[PDB]
């Protein structure tokens, strides 16, 4: 169901910073990033056309914390929806509750946001929700319950979110731990680096 | 070609035969087993390949390759047979499932133990 392994190892293999081990400190400089995937990171890969696609797919999975079976289902939904197939893949991932909770600032990492969702802390439209893959509808109000409000893990994690870019599509109160998911996320608003194109190709064959 | 020739005699679709007559689309079949013996391969290989004449339950009489290093098959001993040619021994078109029934697991195998039917270390 979850990875629960060495998280920063995934970032080296992929190369870029995946925000798995983001947390309290801003920058790591604490893994020999890029040049050490495993025992043979010095080996320059040839890297085929199937490779680059499969690396790009694994990047987007490992960022959002999703497995192949559930990720393949997002592609199937993304294809059936109107407009661009690539933009839908990412938009459906960004609409996940564990992703929204991370983007609100209620969690130093996305795994923390997932557990915070799982453990009955998160609540939306006056209803408790346990599911990380809960598709957050446009015009919703995610929030933390009064029992687990202002605990140790959340207040330190919300201060990290000030250093972050902060999305335009959602808004956060910050005083009373209350969020507001407004519109669906745009392509140009977020990332500007992870290529959807190559993921659309991989599943088509 | 010629659309009227196709009306008169349609496109006869190529009915390709199955490779493995274990019959009735069976994943495996039970074999009582007779004569366990070694055999040499074709051209570039040269070896003593382990193989046995399988008296299948349905009435067929085939040969099946015994994979892995060593085995407990002898004379009789009931064995489970899966599909799959070896591509070396001409005539052999099946494998004995290691681990199933009387065919025991291979001794001291650790990597790839679903194949060869071995337990945890």
């Amino acid at each position: 169901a979850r990875y629960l392994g060495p998280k920063l190892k995934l970032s080296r293999r992929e190369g870029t910073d995946l925000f798995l081990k983001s947390g309290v400190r801003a920058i790591d400089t604490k893994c020999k990033i890029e040049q050490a995937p495993g025992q043979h990171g010095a080996r320059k890969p040839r890297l085929s056309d199937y490779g680059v696609q499969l690396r790009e797919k694994q990047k987007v999975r490992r960022i959002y914390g999703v497995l192949e079976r559930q990720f393949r289902n997002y592609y199937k939904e993304a294809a059936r929806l109107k407009g661009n197939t690539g933009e839908n893949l990412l938009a459906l991932l960004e609409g996940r509750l564990d992703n929204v909770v991370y983007r609100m600032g209620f969690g130093a990492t996305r795994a923390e946001a997932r557990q915070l969702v799982s453990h009955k802390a998160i609540m939306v439209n006056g209803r408790v929700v346990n599911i990380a893959s809960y598709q957050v509808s446009p015009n919703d109000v995610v929030s933390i319950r009064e029992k687990a409000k202002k605990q140790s893990r959340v207040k330190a994690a919300l201060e990290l979110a000030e250093q972050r870019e902060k999305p335009t599509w959602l808004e956060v109160d910050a005083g009373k731990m209350e969020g507001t998911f407004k519109r669906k996320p745009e392509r140009s608003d977020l990332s500007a680096d992870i290529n959807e194109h190559l993921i659309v190709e991989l599943y088509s064959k | 070609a010629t659309v009227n020739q196709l009306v008169r005699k349609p496109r006869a679709r190529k009915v390709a035969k199955s490779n493995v007559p274990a019959l009735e689309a069976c994943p495996q079949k039970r074999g009582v087993c007779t004569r366990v013996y070694t055999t040499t391969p074709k051209k570039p290989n040269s070896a003593l390949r382990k193989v046995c004449r399988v008296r299948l339950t349905n009435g067929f009489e085939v040969t099946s390759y015994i994979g892995g290093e060593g085995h407990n098959l002898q004379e009789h001993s009931v064995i489970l047979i899966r599909g799959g040619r070896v591509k070396d021994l001409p005539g052999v078109r099946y494998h004995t499932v290691r681990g199933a029934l009387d065919c025991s697991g291979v001794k001291d195998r650790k990597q790839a133990r679903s194949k060869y039917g071995v337990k945890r270390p």
């Binding site: - | 659309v3 009227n4 196709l6 009306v7 349609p10």
Partner: protein, 80 residues
């Protein structure tokens, strides 16, 4: 009006009955080309009115034997 069918006669040497072919110009499902498919029917008629080889109008009716459910309506264009 009644659902009649035109058709050319095949044989009339049966006493009080007539076998009639009905050419229908249906197309082939797969290949798309048309076909001149035939429908041979047994038909009832009083006396030997229509001979061999002539156009005949036919109407659906009560069964009056084993086969021969259809019945004659009228003669149009007699035998040459």
């Amino acid at each position: 009006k009644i659902r009649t069918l035109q058709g050319r006669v095949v044989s009339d040497k049966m006493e009080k009955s007539i076998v009639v072919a009905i050419e229908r110009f249906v197309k082939h499902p797969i290949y798309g080309k048309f076909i001149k498919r035939t429908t041979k029917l047994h038909v009832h008629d009083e006396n030997n009115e229509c001979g061999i080889g002539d156009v005949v109008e036919i109407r659906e009716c009560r069964p009056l034997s084993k086969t021969k459910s259809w019945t004659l309506v009228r003669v149009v264009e007699k035998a040459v």
